[PDB]
Amino acid sequence: SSGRENLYFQGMKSFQLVATAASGLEAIVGKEVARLGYDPKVENGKVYFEGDLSAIARANLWLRVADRVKIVVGVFKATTFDELFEKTKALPWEDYLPLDAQFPVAGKSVKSTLYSVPDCQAIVKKAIVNRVSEKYRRSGRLMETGALFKLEVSILKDEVTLTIDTSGAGLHKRGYRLAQGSAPIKETMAAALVLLTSWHPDRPFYDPVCGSGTIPIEAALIGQNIAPGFNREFVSETWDWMPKQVWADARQEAEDLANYDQPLNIIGGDIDARLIEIAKQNAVEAGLGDLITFRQLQVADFQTEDEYGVVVANPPYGERLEDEEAVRQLYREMGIVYKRMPTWSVYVLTSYELFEEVYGKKATKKRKLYRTDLYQYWGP
Predict the structure, then answer these.
(1) What is the DSSP string of 215-238?
(2) Fold adopted by 172-226+258-380
(3) Nearest 5°: CA angle at 236, between 234 and 240?
(4) Dmax of the chain from CA atoms?
(5) Which residues does 329 contact at the CB level (< 8 Å), separation at least 6?
(6) What is the sign, positive or negative, of the torsion defined by CA atoms of 45, 178, 59, 102?
(7) In the chain, what are the domain boundaries?
(8) Is it true that domain 1-171+227-257 has CATH number 3.30.70.3270?
(9) CA-CA distances (angstroms) from residue 171 to 2, 63, 229?
């Protein structure tokens, strides 16, 4: 993180990395990449940075708002498949892919002469096989049986970016919600919401419509400076050219930087007792024991003597009449309750158009996200 180490100690090998992100969340990912001591270049849905083996480990462990961390193998222009072929085979694929690499190729194409994704997939695969076959001298040992190097060819305005996935499962899958679907807020979005607030763990936190507990869990992990990826694995741990010691060092660092003694006052409320039991279990799996206070709690029944807290909510919103009426009632009740809490700040992520009207006051700030809006009521 100092950024000052001689590059010799990481094998004299530097990588062009990228941390992908939802559109509109890249600035936050940039700040997280800077936090790790790297130099971010923020673009639409992508934060590029240079790094070594340790950067791969540390970014996978630590980024909370990124979708995945990839290696950028190369970037060039191509308007014919023969040009895509040659420029792809010119890259040093053998530096990344061992004899037994498994290397499937995914594709994306937008506003490009080369429009056919299946043809781009085919030609990139052709070229990579050509390259490794040449550089391993047509070894009979070349076979796709071992570690996984998921490749992507992405073409935008005739510019080709070739990447290798270092993460495996998307980073939103921290491990604490497995086998529970994706109806709730995406974990990366939940972390983004908390990071867009003023909240610090010295202050109370409340998610009044918490469901299975994602927002409180992400807040707790921020509050104790716990790496989001601490309890999961990454595909790049299986790559023979990345030493296990790099990952062991990154994980020891993550343990050392955590603040497990930071007290937390975090309440998650939901009307569904079964989802509250699920939330408690998810928090145990996240390594948070019973630090979070999950309650079966209707919005209208919340009372506190605590001051200077932060409410953060993202109520599930179905756009049909019954579901919309239930959320209107929720927003109205929130407004009534939080009026009694003038020292608190309130953040509500919703696509319900009449939120401000129903809550009863206009927001301090309205941040547009992906279409949903983050309504922010800044407190003292």
Answers:
(1) HHHHHHHHHTT--TTTTS--GGGG
(2) Rossmann fold (3.40.50)
(3) 140
(4) 75
(5) none
(6) negative
(7) 1-171+227-257, 172-226+258-380
(8) no
(9) 25, 8, 7
